[PDB]
Amino acid sequence: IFAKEIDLPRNVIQHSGNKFILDVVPDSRFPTFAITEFVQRSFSNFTFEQYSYVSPASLVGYLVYMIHAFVFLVDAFERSPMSAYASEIDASHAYLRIIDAFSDAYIPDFLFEILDTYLSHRLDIRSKLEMNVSYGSVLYKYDAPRIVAPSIFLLAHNQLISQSRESTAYEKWLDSIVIHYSRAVIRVGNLVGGLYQSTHFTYRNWFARSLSRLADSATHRTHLRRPMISEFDYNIPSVNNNTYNPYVHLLMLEPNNRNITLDFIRSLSSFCSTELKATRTLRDHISRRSAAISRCVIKGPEAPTWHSSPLDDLKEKSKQGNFSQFCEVAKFGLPRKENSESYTFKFPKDASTIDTAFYLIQENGRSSVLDPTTADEELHTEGMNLLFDPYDDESSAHYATVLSGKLIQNSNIDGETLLLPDPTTGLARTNSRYLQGSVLIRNVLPEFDQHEIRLFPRYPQISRLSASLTLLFNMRQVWIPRFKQKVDEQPKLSNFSWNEGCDGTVPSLNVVTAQQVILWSSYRHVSNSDRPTVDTVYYYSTLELLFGTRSSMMQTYNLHQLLSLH
Amino acid sequence: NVSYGSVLYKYDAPRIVAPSIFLLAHNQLISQSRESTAYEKWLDSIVIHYSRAVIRVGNLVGGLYQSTHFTYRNWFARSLSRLADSATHRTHLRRPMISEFDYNIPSVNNNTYNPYVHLLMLEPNNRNITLDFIRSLSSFCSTEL
Amino acid sequence: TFAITEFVQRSFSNFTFEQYSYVSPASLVGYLVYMIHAFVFLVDAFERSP
């Protein structure tokens, strides 16, 4: 009736938002686990006599290699613009020969079940928000054990051949140096979490129990039943913060490794083609597009499968260790430290000269009840996962989600605040609210540095009603009022939530504005096109500020409780 | 009905055959040793600690005593010794990949002994190995037996 | 256990165990003794009242 009079399609302001690239970095421990179990159940059907490099370790390293190769091809040929890590790889003829080698290398149909979840995606209404997979946000002390280096499996190939009749033959593999990171010898036992010291000890977690089968030389007579055999002469690179490129390290593109890398790629591509009946490549697959990248696994506090402690060379035979002595070395779930009492606050001698409710220094009254969660095996190895899906509530589509490695691992964040729309501002700024559920990683504790992890618990959700928190006039900071001497009325101290008894050993505040936050996320954002720094990378603690609470949430087990080792 | 709800350890321990003895026999069956009687390292293997006491395979099968160690071959140990003798280890190493059971020895007493936890290997440092054991041998029985 | 060990003695050479890293005669005997005790737990937990 009033359609032509109001004429609202000709009387609106529309803006679809600014351009925003959302980076996805998969935790490669989970596809490595699936690939190792794939090779376990299929390798005896293969003929490897015409190959001097093919072993189970080499085949697992090839498939993990082709995952990282897919990531480089998406970041270099599909992301606009390409990341600063991929721009450092020169387009010279040697690099182009290796890129053409893994662009036409044959991949089995199993690995595309994982790789179809890494396809790019652009939202419908947010038509300038893009999700794509790239390692352009990767720092080594933040992401090193969650990104499985394929050079570990060449060393496992070297140990799988050796004619030794020792009991646990995978322990020389755990000694093998992978990289030098500026002053630091990082071994396989640092990245897989199977060898520590306090005398060397072996801890067999779910990742090392799976990978130890590839480097155990008790079955070396099966792998030596061939005319000609060779070993990988892998050269250990020395990098620092200024020269670390994850694509050069993961794709083995150092100048003293490019011939071995090329022979590795072509030998195992021919092996997959002739024996695994692999017919497909990555070249016709990096331009595909699907909404499966927005599915992720939400985890709580889990124990590491790594530690950053420096290991010496294994001279003797290693003993068997346990969970608690590993978590003391890995610095996970430590108790609350003791008050050293090095600083002293200035409390007045007369107590009637101040209003003591307005003075933040006690008379040594109440102590804190904040205690960290000590490392327990049932809590931190058997915790349940959540399956996130923004578009459909089907559990058959999370088969590839539990294998892929897209995850948000949240330990202590309980709330994220959304900026409410202002109808008086410009609509570009209103429709460009993209960094809402994100934390800048200046505040995020690194996992592969020598830091301590104390798990102060999230509040129990066993209340009777739902809770929320609303911020007035400014959400960017929480006000603490400072009063003048003569005020209008009595200030009521009922809205002040006190954190009684702080002594440097408990959290004093619970607000991170724009060391303290324990978070890893697959979903990231870099604020520029330069080298990723700690001031430019954001970890997304959730995607529900973007996709809503109307999205599907399903609860499941861990992958090692779902995929058995046989 | 059948239930182990009446089971005390000092009354019923050798008459209830623990399945963790055979994981240790699997560990000794693999080893590349050319010794004469190779089942005697299996008889040394500790099964459980019962409050102060190291109970071995030779205590539960009755094939290893001392008074110098001696081997007595009764009808139960003569049958079970064939599973842990590494004189035929070349038959069992004819495979691409092999692994050993990393079984952890539990320490129990009168207050904490549960026979279902011990027999079913349900200690917290053994549940992953138990799950892989069950599923691997169920798939083996399904495909071969 | 005696009967299971003699069962595995007379049948194990007909088996292909190459696709398994845990299968041996000792493991198969341990599996069958395990499933006896598992039957006992299932009867006591799901059928005995209480």
UniProtKB/Swiss-Prot annotation, chain A:
<dbReference type="GO" id="GO:0019028">
    <property type="term" value="C:viral capsid"/>
</dbReference>
<protein>
    <recommendedName>
        <fullName>Capsid protein</fullName>
    </recommendedName>
</protein>
<comment type="function">
    <text>The capsid protein self-assembles to form an icosahedral capsid with a T=2 symmetry made of 120 subunits.</text>
</comment>
<keyword id="KW-0167">Capsid protein</keyword>
<keyword id="KW-0946">Virion</keyword>
UniProtKB/Swiss-Prot annotation, chain C:
<comment type="function">
    <text>The capsid protein self-assembles to form an icosahedral capsid with a T=2 symmetry made of 120 subunits.</text>
</comment>
<protein>
    <recommendedName>
        <fullName>Capsid protein</fullName>
    </recommendedName>
</protein>
